[PDB]
Amino acid sequence: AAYDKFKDKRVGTKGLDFSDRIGKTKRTGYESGE
Amino acid sequence: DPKYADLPGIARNEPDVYETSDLP
Amino acid sequence: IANQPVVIDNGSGVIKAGFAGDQIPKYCFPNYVGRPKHVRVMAGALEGDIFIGPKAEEHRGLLSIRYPMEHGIVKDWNDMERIWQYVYSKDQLQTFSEEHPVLLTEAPLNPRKNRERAAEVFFETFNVPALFISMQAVLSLYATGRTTGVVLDSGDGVTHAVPIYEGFAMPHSIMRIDIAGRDVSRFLRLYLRKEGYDFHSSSEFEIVKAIKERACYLSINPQKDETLETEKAQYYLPDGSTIEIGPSRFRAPELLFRPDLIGEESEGIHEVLVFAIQKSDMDLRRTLFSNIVLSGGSTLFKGFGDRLLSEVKKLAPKDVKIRISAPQERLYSTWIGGSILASLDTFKKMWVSKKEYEEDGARSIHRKTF
Amino acid sequence: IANQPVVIDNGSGVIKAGFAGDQIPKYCFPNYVGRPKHVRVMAGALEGDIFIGPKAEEHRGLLSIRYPMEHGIVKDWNDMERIWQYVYSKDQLQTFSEEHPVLLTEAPLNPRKNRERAAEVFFETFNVPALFISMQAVLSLYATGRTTGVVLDSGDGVTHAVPIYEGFAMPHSIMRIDIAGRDVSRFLRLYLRKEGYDFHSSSEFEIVKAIKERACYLSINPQKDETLETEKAQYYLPDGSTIEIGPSRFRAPELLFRPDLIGEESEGIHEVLVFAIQKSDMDLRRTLFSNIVLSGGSTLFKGFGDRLLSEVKKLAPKDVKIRISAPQERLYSTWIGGSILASLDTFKKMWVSKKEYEEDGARSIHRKTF
Amino acid sequence: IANQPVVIDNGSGVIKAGFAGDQIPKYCFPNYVGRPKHVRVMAGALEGDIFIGPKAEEHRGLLSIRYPMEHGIVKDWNDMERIWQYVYSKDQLQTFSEEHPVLLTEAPLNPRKNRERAAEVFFETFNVPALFISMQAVLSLYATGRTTGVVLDSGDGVTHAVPIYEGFAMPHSIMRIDIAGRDVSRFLRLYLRKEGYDFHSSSEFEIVKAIKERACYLSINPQKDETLETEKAQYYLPDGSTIEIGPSRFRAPELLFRPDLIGEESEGIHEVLVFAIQKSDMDLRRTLFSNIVLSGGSTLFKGFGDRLLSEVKKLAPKDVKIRISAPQERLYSTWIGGSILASLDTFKKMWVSKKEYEEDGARSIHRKTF
Numbered sequence A: 001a002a003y004d005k006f007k008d009k010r011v012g013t014k015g016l017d018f019s020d021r022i023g024k025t026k027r028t029g030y031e032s033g034e
Numbered sequence B: 001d002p003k004y005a006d007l008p009g010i011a012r013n014e015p016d017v018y019e020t021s022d023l024p
Numbered sequence C, D, E: 001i002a003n004q005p006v007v008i009d010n011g012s013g014v015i016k017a018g019f020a021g022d023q024i025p026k027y028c029f030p031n032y033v034g035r036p037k038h039v040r041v042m043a044g045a046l047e048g049d050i051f052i053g054p055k056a057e058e059h060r061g062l063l064s065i066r067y068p069m070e071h072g073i074v075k076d077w078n079d080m081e082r083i084w085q086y087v088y089s090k091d092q093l094q095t096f097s098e099e100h101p102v103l104l105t106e107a108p109l110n111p112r113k114n115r116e117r118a119a120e121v122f123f124e125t126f127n128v129p130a131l132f133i134s135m136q137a138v139l140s141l142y143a144t145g146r147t148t149g150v151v152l153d154s155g156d157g158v159t160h161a162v163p164i165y166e167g168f169a170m171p172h173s174i175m176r177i178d179i180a181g182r183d184v185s186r187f188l189r190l191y192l193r194k195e196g197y198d199f200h201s202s203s204e205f206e207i208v209k210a211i212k213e214r215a216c217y218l219s220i221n222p223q224k225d226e227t228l229e230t231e232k233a234q235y236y237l238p239d240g241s242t243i244e245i246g247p248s249r250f251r252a253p254e255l256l257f258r259p260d261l262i263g264e265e266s267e268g269i270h271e272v273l274v275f276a277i278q279k280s281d282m283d284l285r286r287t288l289f290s291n292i293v294l295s296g297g298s299t300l301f302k303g304f305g306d307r308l309l310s311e312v313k314k315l316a317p318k319d320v321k322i323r324i325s326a327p328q329e330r331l332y333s334t335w336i337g338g339s340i341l342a343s344l345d346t347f348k349k350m351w352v353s354k355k356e357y358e359e360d361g362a363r364s365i366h367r368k369t370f
Ligand SMILES: Nc1ncnc2c1ncn2[C@@H]1O[C@H](COP(=O)(O)OP(=O)(O)O)[C@@H](O)[C@H]1O
Pocket: C010, C011, C012, C013, C014, C154, C155, C156, C157, C181, C182, C185, C209, C212, C213, C214, C296, C297, C298, C299, C300, C301, C302, C331
């Protein structure tokens, strides 16, 4: 049932970088599931 | 100054004033 | 084909949208953009980096609030255009902007380039049949149903008084002041920090606004309540925590009557009203005191009428009859006016067609704006 | 990739392994390497100097136990690599490491050098197609099937609380403490010596762990039950000898709520949960109290829910609804989450490829991992 | 009696005490109360449960540290009263509180209740002849010997900027931010945990503060120093163990310019300085850029002036002369000002007498505060 609920959910991994880099303001990983 | 020098928290080997260039 | 025109009240606080003939605005949402501050980690999360209206109201804690328009001037046009795009979305109205004409309501004595740029959007981006910009004061008169009357419209963004006699507006007697509802909320915040309650976040500032709207009374005599020890009325926060508001309740709203408190050397709202009448010709002055109309959200403070009436009486000439009429629907008077005006057959001649804009450009909309 | 990804739950106590789609972890064995301390004299005796999983459990008496990982940090990498080799061996999954992708589940706020070295092994020693490291808290939400909730995951190695709202995680509100299940076992051993029961050997410490799981209840009032004369509850040891545990049953596990007992300057498990919520925005605090999810084996103590709810209620604000939800499979929740996430097609984009690692290096793991 | 007044600089980090006329503060000690956490077993052991100043620094390992004041606001008054009692004791100034007047230096925009309770102590608990509360910024001008200048006082507890022109202080242009030196120490601690060095104890946090002061430089360009390989500067702990700080050296102090790093929705320190000047009238803005005075301990970072001037230059108007003057005694400037002000005969009219307080009460302090 959990798989069926989350089955069609997607994430935007383009431009993804979680690391402690100061350059270029704030970042938020996984933009959208478009 | 030798009077304030006795204190532990004194700035040494630093410029007194920071200022912008007069010439563009 | 002449489709039913859409009325859009471009308020700084809340945008009120509906069709001409509608009794109430069907779609009313706050005029700010909310973007998520926190990072998305889990799949099946809230989609989109932009939230507008009820979607931003429910998830306020997650989002960072940014107001695109301050004191009736649009600082960020990209955000305001996206908000006007949302007005015609599947959530609100559910119609094409190319099919229906548009009626916009701007504040008096605004910059020319602000109005010009706003119009460009509705003629260039949105291929609207016709656009008519209207004054806030004139629409309030259609709503009230009076040709003669002084309209003191104290909004969230700006406060202004426009004296209009038998449908004639005196363009030299118009007085607008930047101090409005938004400044009182910032001024109240200063008193909350002095009591020891910090509200740094943009999400927390909306609670300070809610505290002002819920628990704030305008004292008839300032000094009496200043000298006397207050009850320190408690307010319950969303989380469950209790704060003591105390003297900040009545000290915050004084800003409207005393700009000296924030340090701005401007006239008080009571001086604006009387001065605007005193500028008029000697025989009309008496009628304008007799017919005073209150509008705008910042008039909704408890005891507003009693305090204003006392201040106007002190400044007004002796033995003059002063009758201040305040409609119960103060907030919705501007929109109701737009609906009445838009429904009139004459309105078809009033607006500027898309074709006329393309030929003459900004010149056309600048001629028919007042 | 056609080959199913392998889920590896690198727990301090027991490693849970299996393929994505599987309902329960097929392969669960204790996380330690047992070496024979006694001398081999006869021909036909037990072969090998290394015993892992059920072979170590069967012939425990011969072996000296040595845990490679402490508080989710690999102390001996040579031993940890051999256990990962054991996961792929004929006794466990019996598959090639280069054919299947890997999903690793480490605790939050671990050292960067641990994550870097751990990854290096799966690209250098094992020629894995792609590696993705995931957080324990996020996976627990996939198992429960909820986007919003606070996950209090008290493991054997580490106890941490991560508040996540509609997928979004607040990384600054994450609280981690080294004190966990293994520390209570050591703390109980202290009371067993005071009572007069010696368990010096590494094998005898595993019996102390079994005693803890069998006979320990969490008192609602600790000072009351400490003063009152306790019933001497007898436990039968593997050899046949009977030991009276007595008051040590409830005095030992109290460490979770009172870290001052061992003498560590840290917050109690009840303070960790509430403090993590209090750091979150004012609007979301009431919803986070409403959605509390328990995880880890260290919550299985009798009266945990009763004691925790009493402690949270005292720290929490007045007139707030506090609902603590316990999944029936508390121990297996984290792994099941991994299987659910791994089965999703969105997981394919999340991967760090072998080729990508070789080009960027350690940077790729830090960039793509949370 | 006109006994010489005592100047007390109630700083968040270190309290600076001495008599008026003194060139430097004689008695400077850390602002916290250390209590012994371990049990006393011996009969000749250290006497007392309260250690303040050099006794606490020497025997730090035994004690549990707890700061009574946070962001310049006294949380525990019982502890604050004992510290003022210690100022008068044989270890520090060694004088009667009844004989000498006092000069107190509080931060701007503090709660009214804070001053009221603080005053009660010096008039009721201590029978002080007279008390005068003064601003930190105004005293800095007496120390520097300049009537016109902006005083950016970035302390351990609080950072604030007060623009003062030819003696006149603009109260509406004063900007205060909670983020200060103590927050950078906590933010650095997070990076040490990521490297794999735990400092849970209150005593161990004081070593982290010492590490920051010894080895921490402010990057002129963050992207350059982020890209370039950082030199791993080793620090030796009391036991002998070495720690390599590495890239965390410059990442920690960046918090002052970017509060979004810790996750606080506030303006950067560089915005605070420029915004405070921009709030002032057009005529004074150019002179305020000409007369900028740096103060506080958080300005002592290597390359602070170079980075600040670059950030101010970007925000400031084009082709304006920006001269930032830093006194060599940045830490001691506030107290030196206090001694200069206190030495004046005009000071007799400035302070509030014990009898004057008893008659009027708290009201006298509130009138003269600013
Ligand atoms: N009950 C109330 N008491 C006091 N102030 C109020 C009350 N309700 C609203 N306000 C103030 O009035 C504002 C609404 O302004 P509004 O009339 O919508 O502006 P506009 O004319 O630009 O559309 C609110 O943001 C708030 O500051």
